Amino acid sequence: VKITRLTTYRLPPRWMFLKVETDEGVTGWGEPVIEGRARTVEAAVHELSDYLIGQDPSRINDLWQTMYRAGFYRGGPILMSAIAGIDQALWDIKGKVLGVPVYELLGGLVRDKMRTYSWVGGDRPADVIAGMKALQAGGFDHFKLNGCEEMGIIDTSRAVDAAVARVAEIRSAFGNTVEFGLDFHGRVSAPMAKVLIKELEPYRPLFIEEPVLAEQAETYARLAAHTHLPIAAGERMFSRFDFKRVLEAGGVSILQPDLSHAGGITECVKIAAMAEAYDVALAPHCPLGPIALAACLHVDFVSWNATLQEQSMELLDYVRNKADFALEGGYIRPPRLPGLGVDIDEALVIERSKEAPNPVWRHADGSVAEWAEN
Amino acid sequence: VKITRLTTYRLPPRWMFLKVETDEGVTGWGEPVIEGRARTVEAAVHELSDYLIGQDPSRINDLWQTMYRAGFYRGGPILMSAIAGIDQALWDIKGKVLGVPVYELLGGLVRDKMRTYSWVGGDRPADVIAGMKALQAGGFDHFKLNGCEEMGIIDTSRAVDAAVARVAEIRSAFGNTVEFGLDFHGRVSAPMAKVLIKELEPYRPLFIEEPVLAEQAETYARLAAHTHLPIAAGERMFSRFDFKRVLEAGGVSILQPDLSHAGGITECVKIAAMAEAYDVALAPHCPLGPIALAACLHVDFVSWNATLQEQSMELLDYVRNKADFALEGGYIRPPRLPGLGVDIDEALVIERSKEAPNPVWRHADGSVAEWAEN
Amino acid sequence: MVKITRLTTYRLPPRWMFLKVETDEGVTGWGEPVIEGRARTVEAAVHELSDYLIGQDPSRINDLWQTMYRAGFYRGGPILMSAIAGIDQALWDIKGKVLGVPVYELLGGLVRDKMRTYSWVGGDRPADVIAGMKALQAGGFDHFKLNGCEEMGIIDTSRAVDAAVARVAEIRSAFGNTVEFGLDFHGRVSAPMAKVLIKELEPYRPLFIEEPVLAEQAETYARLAAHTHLPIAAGERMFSRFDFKRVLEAGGVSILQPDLSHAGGITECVKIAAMAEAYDVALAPHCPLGPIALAACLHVDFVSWNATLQEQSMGAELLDYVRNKADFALEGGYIRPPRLPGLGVDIDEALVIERSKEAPDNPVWRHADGSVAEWAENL
Amino acid sequence: MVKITRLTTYRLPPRWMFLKVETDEGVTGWGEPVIEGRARTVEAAVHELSDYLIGQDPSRINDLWQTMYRAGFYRGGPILMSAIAGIDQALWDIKGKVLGVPVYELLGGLVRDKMRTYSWVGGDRPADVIAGMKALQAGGFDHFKLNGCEEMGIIDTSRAVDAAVARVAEIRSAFGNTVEFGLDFHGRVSAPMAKVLIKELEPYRPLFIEEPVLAEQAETYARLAAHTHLPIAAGERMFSRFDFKRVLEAGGVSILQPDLSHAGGITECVKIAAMAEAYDVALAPHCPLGPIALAACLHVDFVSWNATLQEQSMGAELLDYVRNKADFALEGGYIRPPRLPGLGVDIDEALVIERSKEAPDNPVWRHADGSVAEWAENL
Ligand SMILES: [Cl-]
Ligand SMILES: [Cl-]
Ligand SMILES: [Cl-]
Ligand SMILES: [Cl-]
Ligand SMILES: [Mg+2]
Ligand SMILES: [Mg+2]
Ligand SMILES: [Mg+2]
Ligand SMILES: [Mg+2]
The missing domain is CATH 3.20.20.120 (Enolase-like C-terminal domain)
Structure with missing residues (x-):
């Protein structure tokens, strides 16, 4: 069993889904945090996929450690978010392969x-x-x-x-x-x-x-x-x-x-x-x-x-x-359901990814304010 | 560009201004804390001017370090106040020379x-x-x-x-x-x-x-x-x-x-x-x-x-x-305005310096009380 | 005010990335993020941070630095700080050239x-x-x-x-x-x-x-x-x-x-x-x-x-x-x-562009037992 | 009460400064601040602290010490404490001579x-x-x-x-x-x-x-x-x-x-x-x-x-x-x-005055790279 492809999908809110495919036809899904730096996180996912394509998805521990420490400095907000999404999908695969949550x-x-x-x-x-x-x-x-x-x-x-x-x-x-x-x-x-x-x-x-x-x-x-x-x-x-x-x-x-x-x-x-x-x-x-x-x-x-x-x-x-x-x-x-227990509408994911759309808050004095949510 | 002269001016309240002149005719102004030991602070300024006369005012970092550590013990209330006034004037010069605040x-x-x-x-x-x-x-x-x-x-x-x-x-x-x-x-x-x-x-x-x-x-x-x-x-x-x-x-x-x-x-x-x-x-x-x-x-x-x-x-x-x-x-x-952004009335400074004028507060028991302001 | 017009990145041969920040008064600054090992991520980071830069006055480096650092996302980390570092270098390069000093x-x-x-x-x-x-x-x-x-x-x-x-x-x-x-x-x-x-x-x-x-x-x-x-x-x-x-x-x-x-x-x-x-x-x-x-x-x-x-x-x-x-x-x-004014580098921009066309893209080292070794500079 | 009348300083040849505190009963105390490198500042400090001394009873050394230390300014530091040290030495010298003991x-x-x-x-x-x-x-x-x-x-x-x-x-x-x-x-x-x-x-x-x-x-x-x-x-x-x-x-x-x-x-x-x-x-x-x-x-x-x-x-x-x-x-x-009573020094005051007339006044040492070295006693 080998990982064949990673695809990311930007979706209408502040969401990105990723999809890990395997040569057995077992598909995993993960979801990184992107709010704010969507294109950077997307690039991180695809750079880290070099460590995944043609590897056994069952070695989650190995794949996690490789992504975290083997090719770069240890991750911060971006890389850890990317690793999180990939990790979720490898667990989805593993649970699907063994038929359990x-x-x-x-x-x-x-x-x-x-x-x-x-x-x-x-x-x-x-x-x-x-x-x-x-x-x-x-x-x-x-x-x-x-x-x-x-x-x-x-x-x-x-x-x-x-x-x-x-x-x-x-x-x-x-x-x-x-x-x-x-x-x-x-x-x-x-x-x-x-x-x-x-x-x-x-x-x-x-x-x-x-x-x-x-x-x-x-x-x-x-x-x-x-x-x-x-x-x-x-x-x-x-x-x-x-x-x-x-x-x-x-x-x-x-x-x-x-x-x-x-x-x-x-x-x-x-x-x-x-x-x-x-x-x-x-x-x-x-x-x-x-x-x-x-x-x-x-x-x-x-x-x-x-x-x-x-x-x-x-x-x-x-x-x-x-x-x-x-x-x-x-x-x-x-x-x-086996894996993460989410049955993803892949078709509705693919079609809504085709359409792809955060401001800076400042104090009265003009100084930049630390990030918050809406 | 070289520093030519330092002049101090005692002024009617509890103030002292200092003036750093250069051979390009660019003038900086600084203002030390003196409340209380005006003559000592004034002496400190003029002793530290030995490290300034005939030096390039642009090396503020060098001049700051020379004043702070190179000729004496590291400064306390007096020397740091003197260094502060000189520092302000060198920054005034630098901003004036480069035409920016x-x-x-x-x-x-x-x-x-x-x-x-x-x-x-x-x-x-x-x-x-x-x-x-x-x-x-x-x-x-x-x-x-x-x-x-x-x-x-x-x-x-x-x-x-x-x-x-x-x-x-x-x-x-x-x-x-x-x-x-x-x-x-x-x-x-x-x-x-x-x-x-x-x-x-x-x-x-x-x-x-x-x-x-x-x-x-x-x-x-x-x-x-x-x-x-x-x-x-x-x-x-x-x-x-x-x-x-x-x-x-x-x-x-x-x-x-x-x-x-x-x-x-x-x-x-x-x-x-x-x-x-x-x-x-x-x-x-x-x-x-x-x-x-x-x-x-x-x-x-x-x-x-x-x-x-x-x-x-x-x-x-x-x-x-x-x-x-x-x-x-x-x-x-x-x-x-360039430098510190203060246009000093040099003439009104010079004329009011010609006239030059803190008591000890004690407790009821006669003991000296720690310094405060009016 | 003077405005930033464009940011451009250039991946270059000994795995370097050069950054070029342009202004509407013709003053150009250069910066350099370190990319070793995650070139595409840092590149994407630079271009996403540019959103806070285009149309803004390059002289407000403190404001811009704080904006890139804390305003639109969680702080810091090896990707973003490298990107911010490259932009910072170029912004200061601009400031030095505008004021005609190092x-x-x-x-x-x-x-x-x-x-x-x-x-x-x-x-x-x-x-x-x-x-x-x-x-x-x-x-x-x-x-x-x-x-x-x-x-x-x-x-x-x-x-x-x-x-x-x-x-x-x-x-x-x-x-x-x-x-x-x-x-x-x-x-x-x-x-x-x-x-x-x-x-x-x-x-x-x-x-x-x-x-x-x-x-x-x-x-x-x-x-x-x-x-x-x-x-x-x-x-x-x-x-x-x-x-x-x-x-x-x-x-x-x-x-x-x-x-x-x-x-x-x-x-x-x-x-x-x-x-x-x-x-x-x-x-x-x-x-x-x-x-x-x-x-x-x-x-x-x-x-x-x-x-x-x-x-x-x-070297050379x-x-x-x-x-x-x-x-x-x-x-x-x-x-x-x-x-020279700014950072003090006269950048051969035409060589930079020339060699950016011909630049391609992670060495993972393992112990005898098969587990990954923590990344080193030797890569 | 006995009153302090005058403070006088004397810069002397091996870069020393002697301090003389006089009283209205003819009892004189001597003190010594260290001046190396900032002679004029310490001298000015001594004379400014004298304002708290002239007319006061020299026997209240504790009161006077506290007055010089905390009453009219922020505390301490290398200039003021050296000045206070010299005055303290002389005040105690007075006290010892008044009471006829070391x-x-x-x-x-x-x-x-x-x-x-x-x-x-x-x-x-x-x-x-x-x-x-x-x-x-x-x-x-x-x-x-x-x-x-x-x-x-x-x-x-x-x-x-x-x-x-x-x-x-x-x-x-x-x-x-x-x-x-x-x-x-x-x-x-x-x-x-x-x-x-x-x-x-x-x-x-x-x-x-x-x-x-x-x-x-x-x-x-x-x-x-x-x-x-x-x-x-x-x-x-x-x-x-x-x-x-x-x-x-x-x-x-x-x-x-x-x-x-x-x-x-x-x-x-x-x-x-x-x-x-x-x-x-x-x-x-x-x-x-x-x-x-x-x-x-x-x-x-x-x-x-x-x-x-x-x-x-x-030495000598x-x-x-x-x-x-x-x-x-x-x-x-x-x-x-x-x-001898007080500090135990019989000071040749007439030599002190003689040599104070003929005493003139900062060696700054730099590393090879040109930056200043932190001050040492070797100066
Ligand atoms: Cl990161
Ligand atoms: Cl001091
Ligand atoms: Cl990061
Ligand atoms: Cl002091
Ligand atoms: Mg919260
Ligand atoms: Mg207060
Ligand atoms: Mg190293
Ligand atoms: Mg020693």
Whole structure:
């Protein structure tokens, strides 16, 4: 069995799918993070395919290590994202060849179902409430909201108060019936960080995600020593050494490794087991497509320390087996089909790739602002 | 091109200007810190001019290093202040020779405008409010006030309460509409430090500047671990090693390097870039004259991590290009003219130097009190 | 305002990539990213970063650097920082030509008059290395860099330690203390064999041991250095200032070697050099093989007081795309400051284009057991 | 109350500055700031600090010391602490004369009967150094200080390491373990060459290695000391007690050498010596060349139990402005306690004035590459 071809497909949202074909006619699918540097990531995939074409896809460990360390410097945001997509597809192949879901190869189930939380948006606080009340009747009680009331940076007491007032209004609609985490995207100024966290404390969010962009992991420990609220982080980390430093410093209660960024299944299973050695909950980050979500589920269903799973609900378009990702009580069931358990509509992928379409945010003073999402 | 002459000029407030002349007729201006030891600083300048006369002013790096390390022990408060003034003038020369503002030589703009805050005084709390309300209609919303209600030391609960009552009355006049930082000048006793900071917390100042005079940088970290309020410091630091120790200990959210004290542009650009490596905002300290303010602006407009700029508004007297330092919305624009962007009235400098004029504060017990400002 | 119009890349024969940034006032800057091994990815990175550049004023290098670094994506890494490094070199080249001066003049002027260089010497046998060293020595050189291992492969046996030492011993016998050499091991020593190799190399007094192991933790270098009197050199695998700070905070590295074509260019490397000054370390920039990036290195050396040595690769081959070859001539192992405005390279653009037409494109080395060896410069 | 009337400074020929503090009861004290290299700045500092002194009671030395140190300006630094040191010496001189006793009597009395001295020996060649050492040895000396390097310049090569060692080796052969010598390197060793030089000096057993490198971080000394059995001496570049505490907290310095003319005078140096006692360190004050400041050193030695050695520079030249020369005579390398009230110096004021009329006024040394070398005592 040998790898024959790699193809990438840019798709209408901020998605890229890749397809690994083999001489046995077994096809794997992976999904890299691209938001922002789509053409670079695409080039990385095709450069790394030199190490794959005519190799046995079953040696995932060998292929992972070759891509990561054998031909270049160790990967950062671009290469680790490319390696992640390829890794996902090799696992898809392996599970298809052996006729079982990926979690079965990785020791089998450690749980029967997995708790999920959803991201909820809205321009007004009333809009956010409405969306949460909709998903609540659907069966959810765990949510993730943007902490930022408006677009920009939290600079002033006035900006802190407005952000807290929004959170207050949202909390008063539910009390302790629902849980929500707040993601600030690192868009809080260093002087405001501690006062904001303190002002949110009465309204008790489940976590605070990325209050600031840390240069040293000591600042998360310094922030956490001030608050009862759990600090969540991990989406901007790729190396195992990024995670180890964050975990050894402490101050991060909830770790959020992205499957599509941190080197894939091969690597995220290791990050999960490293997280166990510290007193830290695991909540794998994935708001991407269906291939990457499925990849996350396989890590969730083998790692005992995984507690919550992020999903963005769209990703039902390119998948034929939509019912496998149905949610009851805010819980997802294990993938059912061999490999990653996603039946990809290859034809609908091919046709929509034929059409191919992020701005710079700046402060008032004109200075460039650190990257966030929409 | 060669340096021909250095002249110092003592001026009516607590200011000294220096003037570096060249054989091409290109003149640079610098401004050292002197408050207090004016004759010593003046002597330092003229002793260091032995390393300058007949040298190419373009080798600022060489001249800086020669002054700092080649003929004596490494500088403290006096020599670093002298070096700072000379450094500013060599940068003024260089920018004049190449016909561009200083920030252009240092990589160009990282921002379009710079946020400023002003110092506001007043004997009564009502006077302080009035001055703030005046500048607010002018366009300001960021201020810096003395924390000390009266002249002396914060020793007692009665002294803490009076200082907090003053701050309370000021805050109630504005709410969260304006921001203000409190400068205590290190005039709080070590037992009172923590209770005062805690009592000010409801009224949420933007920062607390120099609550105590630290002997070890561990005490700022110990103070900051107790409070949500940001600790600002840096005006009493000269060496890069003073700043590094403060930054590595943590507990200082806002760094305040003085351009006219910490070795000038050559050195403060380095302090700025070092501050980036820690999670610390930069607010360069300058309440002096127009040459030093201009020098600060050039550091602000090249360093991404600079957030607020102190200005004392007088310094419009000796400058012919007053409109270049106009403030809209509490924002300053980049310097426009070559060099530092200050057109110095040399004649008005020369004539007012012909007339040349700080007391010891003591506690009740007779003991000498650590230096502060008026 | 002056506006950037176009970025163009040129893959060239000794696996180099040249970058050309054009402006609408006819002023052109040149940059050089290092591409070894991932040429197409870096090329794609350069063109994607150009989106933040076309139509913008090239004089705002700080703004543009920050925009490329943090605005549209996650920070840093070996691909993006190499791309940013090349753009940075060209932007500063523009700034110097506009203001009619070399880059070092903008960065505060000269801190020295000339810069000590050293070169890498090769050869399979010690006799060859000696001869090459003597050939350069007659031309005034007395500082050198060598590979620590005779051929490709990991040092994981006493036999391999002994053979590496014997080679170095024989090289040392021909010169005594009359020359200095550093030894680069490219991280190809097993962590069990590291301390014994280092110890066995002590009587032969190399100036440094560069990259003995690939350190996962920063404390690794500090533990090696506490065992030996020999200086440890590192830096080429570090891409952000914050990677450099960590290693400097741990101690154990005596000589820091930032790459100008990898660690974000002049803008970031002047800050790295400044950061290193607050530690007891010597600075010796890991300079890439090409001339544009060599020029970038020199500008950093001529403004950083703590810069002591400068690696370069001269033959007869580096000076082919450069018309002003005499500006980079060496006397007594020293290079003069760049003379022409900007980076100080007059680039033969017509040769660059000519040879970009004829340039084609990953050597993966494996241990005897079949597992991949971590990548080395030997490729 | 008794009032200070006047301060007067006197620049004198071997680049010394004497300070004279007068009172309205006719009691005069003498002090000595070290000025090397910034004479006019320190002179101006002394006269500006006099503003806090004129009209004040000289007996309140603690109040006055604190006033000069913290009241009117930012603290400390090499200029102000040297000026404060000179004023402190004179104030205590006043106090001792008023109470009719030596300074050590005020500071708790004698802790020893005599103080072990050592002297610096010079000479370009080892043969000269040996001869000078033998000349002092015949006079009962057995402890010495030498410069570690043959001439001015940085040790940055194996060749320079080897030559420095060979010199020390040859000096050691003439004596064996019969004499002790320390080696001062004045911070003129590159941080890569530091550990190898120190290691190569171990068989020749110097009593200490003084200032091998200029430590940016305090951890530098601790890292050097963990490699060697040789004691590291430091202290001359430290001006505040808090600089001393940091270095002592880091460890790695076995012998602390505070300068009495630089670190705030007697008032601060007795506290520095007290602070050092709580660490496993020997105290050996870096005494300046002049006699007034030498007297100040002795008073600290004769009250501090942890003071072990005392550096002095005797010919034939130190004793010129001192009338009571026999009070500072040496027997077997030992000095007796000062005998006269105050600091114990009878100052020939009329010679001081005479020679102050005829005294004129910065040697900047550069590396081969043209950059400035960090300042050394050799100037
Ligand atoms: Cl990467
Ligand atoms: Cl000073
Ligand atoms: Cl990257
Ligand atoms: Cl000083
Ligand atoms: Mg997030
Ligand atoms: Mg202040
Ligand atoms: Mg190398
Ligand atoms: Mg000495």
